[PDB]
Design an enzyme around this catalytic site. Structure first.
Site, short mmCIF file in Angstrom:
data_model
loop_
_atom_site.label_atom_id
_atom_site.label_comp_id
_atom_site.label_asym_id
_atom_site.label_seq_id
_atom_site.Cartn_x
_atom_site.Cartn_y
_atom_site.Cartn_z
N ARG A 340 -33.94 95.52 67.25
CA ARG A 340 -34.95 95.36 68.33
C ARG A 340 -35.54 96.70 68.77
NH1 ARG A 340 -31.50 90.59 67.72
NH2 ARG A 340 -31.28 89.64 69.79
N1 ATP Z 1 -43.78 88.76 65.09
C1 ATP Z 1 -42.78 89.50 64.63
N2 ATP Z 1 -43.05 90.48 63.73
C2 ATP Z 1 -42.04 91.22 63.28
N3 ATP Z 1 -40.74 91.16 63.57
C3 ATP Z 1 -40.51 90.18 64.46
C4 ATP Z 1 -41.44 89.34 65.02
N4 ATP Z 1 -40.82 88.46 65.90
C5 ATP Z 1 -39.56 88.79 65.86
N5 ATP Z 1 -39.30 89.82 64.99
C6 ATP Z 1 -38.03 90.46 64.71
O1 ATP Z 1 -36.99 89.60 65.10
C7 ATP Z 1 -36.31 90.14 66.26
C8 ATP Z 1 -36.01 89.02 67.23
O2 ATP Z 1 -35.28 89.55 68.36
P1 ATP Z 1 -35.33 88.71 69.73
O3 ATP Z 1 -34.37 89.28 70.71
O4 ATP Z 1 -36.76 88.54 70.14
O5 ATP Z 1 -34.79 87.29 69.25
P2 ATP Z 1 -34.63 85.98 70.15
O6 ATP Z 1 -34.53 84.79 69.26
O7 ATP Z 1 -35.67 86.02 71.20
O8 ATP Z 1 -33.21 86.22 70.83
P3 ATP Z 1 -32.40 85.29 71.86
O9 ATP Z 1 -32.41 83.91 71.25
O10 ATP Z 1 -31.02 85.87 71.97
O11 ATP Z 1 -33.16 85.35 73.16
C9 ATP Z 1 -37.25 91.23 66.77
O12 ATP Z 1 -36.58 92.22 67.53
C10 ATP Z 1 -37.81 91.77 65.46
O13 ATP Z 1 -36.88 92.58 64.79
#
Ligand code: ATP
Ligand code: ATP
Ligand code: ATP
Ligand code: MG
Ligand code: MG
Ligand code: MG
Lengths: 476, 471, 56, 470
Positions: A340
């Protein structure tokens, strides 16, 4: 009054009658000299967890209130000593000689007290520094099956932190004691112990101390953090802390849940992992940093304890056994591992050289799966499939061999910019070593500029140096 | 006073009320000796071990013999100590029960000989010693793929009837002749036929003079089976520390220690977790297995058999024990049925000694290269299962030919197999084992047929076995 | 060519019969593993429910 | 009329009010103690009632840690539910669950209006249900599940797949342009992301139109349960009394459902299903049925939900699925292939994909894409075992187009500037329809497939190919 008597003793858990002024979370002292913590308070029975050998505590023994909430000893004297979760020396070598104490149930630094993490933690492993970066104060999870190399990626990190003014803590939870002595002798040989603290909770100990060990470890590091010096923490298994709570709880009689875990597994892990932060300039700009571990049966990402911990941390590093047996070490599945904070935690040179890499090593993984089923292919696919294999080679690295960051950026610049294509695949690992030798003897100016500026030198000069070496190298 | 009374009886478990202020300690032993005072009653000798303090002057106790006949009000005497086992030179050549009594009909152990407790604290961090050297068993698969370590823990996983005891007997035969040191054999949940059979193997050999044996078997009440492993280890701990001799400790089935705890734990009144296992599984296993360690004073090497409950490795008990072991071999039923003896999984077995430093570079490039060929074969298992080998191309064809050669050349003829198959056995030294794999991997023996690569010792034997066929 | 084409079609026919027979055998073997699992999960969820209900 | 603590059971406390003037469910109490002696610890606590037991005794859930609590202390009864500042005083400031400002900016006056967090939901006499389309600039949503203005929108996914990242792209685009109040709340929110969002709002200047409620992963369960209702009372005051149109952003509403479980056993409730509360559908209904757009004014609502163990068949997601107007489901299999945002184009459906609410040309193209991707799913099984060359020309042309369609659903975001180097793009809806129509008709099939990843408009794909050399 402040005196009570034990009524039930079993399996490390005790109930006492009396003790009216006790607090939740207090320390209580038995006659034997064994200490204890009060976790429940019914109308007629106080519920106490024993923090020591219970084979001398009988029904009708007295227990007396200390007056202190649970406190762990802290000071500069702990550095270089092997210690218990309670502040008690284990290595021999006499007392720890600490000065003060901290609570193990501290509040985390709030919003408005933190800054974006803005400084690298250079591990010296090509795959982690290039693809899945870590910055001071970013929690990162190492998750893999048994015997996949997880401990090595952590120990290699501590060894490559000598120059920086860092303080490191290793908490061994549930490990057999012989292994911890082996780790300590390994650190002493690489000279690492001079700036490190080892906390031990062996598999023979009552589960209550296993449960307290991670909290003691962060309680020791936050002292340095609020004073300004940067810190790193490693937890050898959080999956053994979970198992230990399940015994501590099922025993207490609290009803069960998903599997047999209580529902307070997410609270337990959040309480611990949210004390890791980068404080702002008003607080003096310190940093804690955390590296928890998690082992998964059959190597599965989709399961209860693995997904709970994957929800808290600021990324993950997933290690796979089938990659490990196929010659890629350290084996990191690039598709399932993302950071992240990636992008802010790098020197400017590495951002420019190696930005699309984590996605790149994912397109190759998919295009390999499709073409094992595609027969003939076109020119644009034969070109790209080659890059991923050239990349998987350049990412390989043996145990106890660190590579400095300036050398990582130069080999990745051959890889990203593409001069590396000519060399056959089998010679790529060898080409790397000869390139490092040539760079040291001849190319002191390019490395000087990288150490001086944290930025890339003029392209013509780099192209000149690398093209000249491509004259010197001999190939199949 | 020291005398206490029985109040409740519940299969293995018993409840003993004591006088106010005079209760036993938490692993202390008690005695019941009763003589029938009427025709209806029956006579008893029994001993019990304290396990929980229940309130109201009551201590909950697991039992060490059958509780049939127990009448509420049977009186209890207090030993004042844990179960105390006779130790010293007098143990050598003798067969024992959990109580320490000799069951060999050679006499009874003199009452003045020192007896030490069963439950003692584990060894400290300052004392433990870490070193590596390699132990040689002559068994091909162990010597290349997952080598055993002197002074370590060696674990043999497998399901019901898959070949654990025969591999243990081959290890006893080779190692205990070459060892020059003390041995202890401890049988927990061991089929009784084996106990009569081995005692006779050890007496006929003359190896009995330097070894001691504890047995508690499938027929005994659950309480006795738990404490038998701890009993065997207090004798072994005297040989390592006070005599100072190096020791081998063999355990017949370590799974029965958890299983016996599972039954008694539910009656003790604890809640259950996971697949019915007790809420104290990790701590109870670890308390036993941390004692089994090499020290500055001397060394113990322990060889243990783990029964998987069904063919399910993920089950809680087998997987809690994986962490405490240095070298592990996992036998697989599917191979046993193909005819591969011993049935070791080449890719699941792991050991800390396959390190370029400890086993050397040559034994290293060769071991990993073997694993790389075999792992590809598992990926190609689920394609060749339907279509056959027409779909495969190029490298797929060459890889399957060499994988077939490797998988049959890991199978061996044992001296202990002579009671089942008429063939003689073979011992393959390590330098031969490493050398043999290379020629298969290079492809120097591509021409010879797959049926000539089964149940052979050193590589040459394959050439004469092929020449017998002429294929 | 008449021998070659007649013998080909025949070859494809033989392979396809054996391929179908291997696939149908794998379907019964896999089907039993699914049933064994469905029975297993149902027992687990019931026992976790009743264990908490017995505690409370 | 004061009270006394009897049992402290971790998160739960039991207070016996002896006067016989017991309190009410949903009311809040106060524990203020100054230490008499050195042994004690000073305590300041609020507790919300849950249940009346027999012996004049009431069960209560705390809103701070029960460390240092001693039996026999004093509890003061406010006589009301938790009360929150509502008014223009909220604009531009961040508050805790109790309406106390966390931020260093200042302290709210005691003369200000406060409203009660608990209230019955709007009624069938005065709800409304008109449809409009909300533009985002994100290709998948703008084609296959258009968000409806004034409706509920839900982002579902398992752990670590992009829920937070997709919320930050929507807030950059929708926040600046919208002319109405926007409330953002954080039940179970990662702190390292709450702090980052404050500085992102300060950079742009969205802060003057915003209010924030933060409840972190590290708080006692009680706090995580009520931090959704606090944000909602503020958004309700702006909808009803001021009458401006509004956006609500709730972050990880699963953490509301998860908190109830933790406190259920200590409250005395028997367990249900997969270790869940006996009252799951009720609590979800009470919260969710307040989040509506009435005849007075509209709340457009965007929520993140975490799929508890990568199992969409779990009770908490299943019950939640019934309350939404548009839903995007996120899949880890797509995230492994690197196709971001990782959205299921089949499982994501919205009530607005009807010919009248989007037009005949839009609907034709949308359903035709959904046939292509369902055909590719069944065909992958045949390819995996038998091989791709074995199949017909129509089967080959499906696999050709489906690969391109699936990669062209990926897009370069502004919040992917930090994650992927490249700056980012906004695609208007008219353009998205033109381009997807060209892929389906085969005009651009000559280009190599690798050029469709992380891009915005089809014009760009032509140039990206030129660099490769095609
Ligand atoms: N549009 C995108 N482009 C590139 N990488 C992305 C994108 N969306 C997500 N990622 C990658 O995936 C990761 C997802 O981390 P994030 O904490 O947002 O997951 P999450 O599913 O929201 O977590 P949680 O379910 O615990 O709240 C990002 O930090 C990045 O590395
Ligand atoms: N780059 C590498 N090249 C060769 N061997 C490697 C490499 N990295 C790790 N190994 C080997 O892999 C094994 C790793 O053992 P280790 O105990 O560190 O694994 P682990 O997965 O951390 O163990 P655990 O499951 O107990 O946490 C050792 O044999 C080690 O030497
Ligand atoms: N090396 C071998 N040579 C010949 N036969 C073998 C060999 N290994 C296994 N078998 C056969 O398979 C069976 C193995 O019996 P064994 O006594 O070893 O079972 P086990 O795994 O130890 O039993 P248990 O699970 O009850 O402890 C016997 O019939 C034996 O003849
Ligand atoms: Mg490890
Ligand atoms: Mg046996
Ligand atoms: Mg998120």
């Amino acid at each position: 009054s402040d005196v009570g008597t034990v009524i039930q003793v079993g399996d490390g858990i005790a109930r006492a009658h009396g003790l009216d002024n006790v607090m939740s979370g207090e320390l209580v002292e038995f006659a034997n000299g064994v200490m204890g913590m009060a976790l429940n308070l019914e109308e007629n029975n106080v519920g106490i967890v024993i923090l020591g050998p219970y084979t001398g505590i009988k029904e009708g023994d007295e227990v007396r209130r200390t007056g202190r909430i649970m406190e762990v000893p802290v000071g500069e004297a702990l550095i270089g000593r092997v210690v218990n979760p309670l502040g008690q020396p284990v290595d021999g070598l006499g007392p720890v000689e600490t000065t003060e104490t901290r609570p193990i149930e501290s509040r985390a630094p709030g919003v408005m007290d933190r800054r974006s993490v803005h400084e690298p933690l250079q591990t010296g492993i090509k795959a982690i520094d290039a693809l899945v970066p870590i910055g001071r104060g970013q929690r990162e999870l190492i998750i893999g099956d048994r015997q996949t190399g997880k401990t090595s990626v952590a120990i290699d990190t501590i060894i490559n932190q000598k120059d920086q003014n860092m303080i490191s803590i290793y908490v061994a939870i549930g490990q057999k004691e012989s292994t911890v002595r082996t780790v300590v002798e390994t650190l002493r040989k690489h000279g690492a112990l001079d700036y490190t603290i080892v906390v031990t909770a062996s598999a023979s100990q009552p589960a209550p101390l296993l449960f307290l060990a991670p909290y003691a470890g962060v309680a020791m590091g936050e002292y340095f953090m609020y004073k300004g010096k940067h810190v790193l923490v490693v937890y050898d298994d959080l999956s053994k802390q979970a198992a230990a709570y399940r015994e501590l709880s099922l025993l207490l009689r609290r009803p069960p849940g998903r599997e047999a875990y209580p529902g307070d597994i997410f609270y337990l892990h959040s309480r611990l992992l949210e004390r890791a932060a980068k404080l702002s300039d008003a607080k003096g700009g310190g940093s804690l940093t955390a590296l928890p571990f998690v082992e998964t049966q059959a190597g599965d990402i989709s399961a209860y304890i693995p997904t709970n911990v994957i929800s808290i941390t600021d990324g993950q590093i997933f290690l796979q056994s089938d990659l490990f047996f196929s010659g890629v070490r350290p084996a990191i599945n690039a598709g399932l591992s993302v950071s992240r904070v990636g992008g802010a935690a790098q020197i400017k040179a590495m951002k420019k050289v190696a930005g699309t890499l984590r996605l790149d090593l994912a397109a190759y993984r998919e295009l390999e799966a499709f073409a094992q089923f595609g027969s003939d292919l076109d020119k644009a696919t034969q070109a790209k499939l080659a890059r991923g294999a050239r990349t998987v080679e350049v990412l390989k690295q043996d145990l106890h061999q660190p590579i400095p960051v300036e050398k990582q950026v130069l080999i990745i610049y051959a890889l990203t910019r593409g001069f590396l294509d000519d060399i056959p695949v089998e010679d790529v690992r060898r080409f790397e070593k000869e390139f490092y030798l040539f760079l040291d003897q001849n190319g002191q100016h390019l490395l000087e500029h990288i150490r001086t500026t944290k930025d890339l030198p003029n392209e013509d000069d780099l192209n000149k140096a690398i093209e000249a070496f491509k004259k010197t190298f001999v190939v199949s | 006073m020291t005398r206490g009374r029985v109040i409740q009886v519940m299969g293995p478990v018993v409840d003993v009320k004591f006088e106010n202020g005079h209760l036993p300690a938490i692993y202390n032993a008690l005695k019941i000796q009763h003589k029938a005072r009427n025709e209806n009653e029956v006579d008893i000798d029994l001993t019990l071990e304290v396990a929980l303090h229940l309130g109201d002057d009551t201590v909950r106790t697991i039992a060490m013999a059958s509780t049939d006949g127990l009448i509420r009000g049977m009186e209890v005497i207090d030993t004042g100590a844990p179960i105390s086992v006779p130790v010293g030179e007098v143990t050598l050549g003798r067969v024992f029960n959990v109580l320490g009594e000799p069951i060999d009909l050679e006499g009874d152990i003199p009452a003045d000989a020192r007896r030490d407790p069963i439950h003692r604290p584990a060894p400290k961090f300052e004392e433990l010693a870490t070193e590596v050297e390699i132990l040689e068993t002559g068994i091909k698969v162990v010597d290349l793929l997952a080598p055993y370590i002197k002074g370590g823990k060696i674990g043999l996983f497998g399901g019901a009837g898959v070949g654990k005891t025969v591999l243990i007997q081959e290890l006893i035969h080779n190692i205990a002749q070459e060892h020059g040191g003390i041995s202890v054999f401890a049988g927990v949940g061991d089929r009784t036929r084996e106990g009569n059979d081995l005692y006779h193997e050890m007496k006929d050999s003359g190896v009995i003079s330097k070894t001691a044996m504890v047995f508690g078997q499938m027929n005994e009440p659950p309480g006795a089976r738990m404490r038998v492993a701890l009993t065997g280890l207090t004798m072994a701990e005297y040989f390592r520390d006070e005599q100072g001799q190096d020791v081998l400790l063999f355990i017949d089935n370590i799974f029965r220690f958890t299983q016996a705890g599972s039954e008694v734990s539910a009656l003790l009144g604890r809640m259950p977790s996971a697949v019915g296992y007790q809420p104290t599984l990790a701590t109870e296993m670890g308390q036993l297995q941390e004692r089994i360690t090499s020290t500055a004073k001397g060394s113990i090497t322990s060889i243990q058999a783990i029964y998987v409950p069904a063919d399910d490795y993920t089950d809680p008990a087998p997987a809690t024990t994986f962490s405490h072991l240095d070298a592990t071999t996992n036998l697989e039923r599917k191979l046993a049925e193909m005819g591969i003896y011993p049935a070791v999984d080449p890719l699941a077995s792991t050991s800390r000694a396959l390190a370029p430093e400890i086993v050397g570079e040559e034994h290293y490039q060769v071991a990993r290269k073997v694993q790389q060929t075999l792992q590809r074969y598992k990926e190609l298992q689920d394609i060749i299962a339907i279509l056959g080998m027409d779909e495969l191309s190029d490298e797929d064809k060459l890889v399957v030919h060499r994988a077939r050669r490797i998988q049959f050349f890991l199978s061996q003829n044992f001296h202990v197999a002579e009671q089942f198959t008429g063939q003689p056995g073979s011992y393959v030294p390590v330098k031969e084992t490493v050398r043999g794999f290379k020629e298969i991997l290079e492809g120097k023996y591509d021409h010879l047929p797959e049926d000539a690569f089964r149940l052979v010792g050193r590589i040459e034997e394959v050439v004469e076995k092929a020449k017998a066929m002429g294929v | 060519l008449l021998d070659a084409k007649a013998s080909e079609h025949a070859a494809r026919m033989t392979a396809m019969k054996n391929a179908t027979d291997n696939a149908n055998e794998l379907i019964r073997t896999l089907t039993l593993s699914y049933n064994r699992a469905r029975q297993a999960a149902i027992t687990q969820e019931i026992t976790e429910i009743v264990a908490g209900a017995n505690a409370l």
